[PDB]
């Protein structure tokens, strides 16, 4: 028993690491197959990342304008192109540790491994959460762009993030491995704002269960609601509202404990509307919302 | 900037870990050169658990009771013998992926990564702290026996903790890579309690000062307090005592920020007399113990 932020074993990743640079300008990329992908912004100069026009800085490179790092084996890049806010380099050498991968593009609600770098090299891993409005809250100091977000399914590895700058609140934006974007923001730095986040509401629901799971059990009671009840008070505190799918989805965690979703919300909704009055659910004084059900089935099953 | 519960790469320790199997019994080894260490109870059976002896259960094994499961590849099992509480295991292959490291024993307050897993399978990665009372607050289900824990520093994995057993307030025990409890715990299932637990005060300062790198300022006030001063109410509130060596470690967090560590203890005696009122510190609306000043410089600094 017991309940962590657990991050998904990094070492399949940390292979893919290179580091990139590009004039005085460097930061990591993702090594697969015999493509180098990194954020396009490594392409232009401080004075550059007020207003740039990609298309122009990027015709006046060539090949060898691109130094690539992997450990001390440097890589001679043969081709280059850009797809949306990314840059692919076409290398001479296949990197022999490419996983098996796929490319994904997740939605908010669910989670993901940070592998955080800096200069092409691995310092760290940490769980996070897509929030609904398409940030994530990370950690990431200056070089961190490139790193990488990805889950792994039975062997393969899916990439979902790739890391590109900070928001003025302290919260990270990036894209997919496609190079868009998630949410309404812009790799040049003009005034942008993230919209105003909300709670994922089955998350935090999931998380009730791991606590029940583990023997946290009072602010359990007696009490059923119905969804439409339910939704109407979530959106009086800034909650995601539940939907049916998220019924289905909480199943297996509400067979595994006896109980059922809705008598589940009914302890949520008062959790809510009173407070936890100085009491704590697995080690936590506030309501959770960064684990999905399928993190706590792998944790706790 | 922001901050995280942030754990090690795990891949240097991901290539250490095999299966071990011993009759009906398997859980998880670290294989080194030509050794695999494992926690001795593999040698049990769910009847032997209870008062085993350990000596006895050995003598009747011999090496090719012991199936050792690297992936696809048997490992031959040359030898054995007992260290404490680890069984080593001598094959007849040195691991190829084998890390630079060393073996550790470390002090309650410190922190590490876990790499838990299952079936000689890495499953996930976490970082926590040794408590007070020597263990710790994991995740850990049957099977479990045998991840351990480390800390990267440089090129050297240092290991620190192999898993084996959970007590029943829901918190772990094991060794050191040596066979060693942390604490006075046994590795048989009898009646065992785990001491009171208390909060790891330097740490509660060194994640103060990177809420204040970060931006989080509310709780700062103009005062300041004394060693003996603020002991004095830490006492109360089952906090661990503040040293000078502990002052010294946070030099770097009180250079940086400009606030002197005895600021900063006026501003958590405050913090304990009354609480948060509501308020929330990167993130928490409680104390939070389980970063080192090495870990917030680490995670604040490069
Ligand atoms: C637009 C808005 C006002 C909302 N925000 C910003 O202007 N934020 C800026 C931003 O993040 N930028 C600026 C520049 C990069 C992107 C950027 O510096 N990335 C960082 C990661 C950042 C740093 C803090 N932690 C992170 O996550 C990064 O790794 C890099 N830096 C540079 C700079 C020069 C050359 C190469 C690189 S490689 C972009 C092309 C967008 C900062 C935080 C520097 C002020
Ligand atoms: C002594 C005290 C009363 C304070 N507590 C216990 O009796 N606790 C017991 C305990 O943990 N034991 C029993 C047995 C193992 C050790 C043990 O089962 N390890 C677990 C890891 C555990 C499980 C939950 N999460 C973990 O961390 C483990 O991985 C293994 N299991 C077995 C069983 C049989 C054969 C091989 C193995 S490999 C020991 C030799 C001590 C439990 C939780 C099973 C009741």
């Known amino acids: 028993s017991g309940f962590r932020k657990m991050a ?27 493509v180098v992908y990194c954020p396009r912004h490594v392409i232009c100069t401080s004075e550059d990342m007020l207003n740039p026009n990609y298309e122009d800085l990027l015709i006046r490179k060539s090949n060898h304008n691109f130094l690539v790092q992997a ?19 076409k290398v001479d050498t296949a990197n022999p540790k490419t996983p098996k991968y796929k490319f994904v593009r997740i939605q908010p609600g669910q989670t ?27 950690s990431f100091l200056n070089g961190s762009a490139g790193s990488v977000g990805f889950n ?33 923001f812009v790799d040049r730095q003009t005034a942008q704002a993230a919209g105003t986040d909300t709670t994922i509401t089955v998350n935090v629901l999931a998380w009730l269960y791991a606590a029940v799971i583990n023997g946290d059990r009072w602010f359990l009671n007696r009490f059923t609601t119905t ?19 998220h019924v289905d989805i ?52």
């Open 112 to 138: 993901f491994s940070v592998l955080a770098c800096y200069n092409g090299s691995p310092s760290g891993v940490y769980q996070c959460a897509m929030r609904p409005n398409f940030t994530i809250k990370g």
């Open 152 to 184: 792994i399914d039975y062997d393969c590895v899916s990439f979902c993030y790739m890391h590109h700058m900070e928001l003025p609140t302290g919260v990270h934006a990036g894209t997919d491995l496609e190079g868009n974007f998630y949410g309404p």
């Open 227 to 245: 969804l439409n009840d339910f939704n109407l008070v979530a959106m009086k505190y800034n909650y995601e509202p539940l939907t049916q799918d």
């Open 71 to 89: 450990g001390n084996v440097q890589l001679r890049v043969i081709g280059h192109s850009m797809q949306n806010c990314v840059l692919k380099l």
């Open 250 to 301: 909480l199943g297996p965690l509400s067979a595994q404990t006896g109980i059922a979703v809705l008598d589940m919300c009914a302890s949520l909704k008062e959790l809510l509307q009173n407070g936890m009055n100085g009491r704590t659910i697995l080690g936590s004084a506030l309501l959770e919302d960064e684990f999905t059900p399928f993190d706590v089935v792998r944790q706790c099953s």
């Open 8 to 34: 998904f074993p990094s070492g399949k990743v940390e292979g893919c690491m290179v580091q990139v640079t590009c004039g005085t300008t460097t930061l990591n990329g993702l090594w697969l197959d015999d």
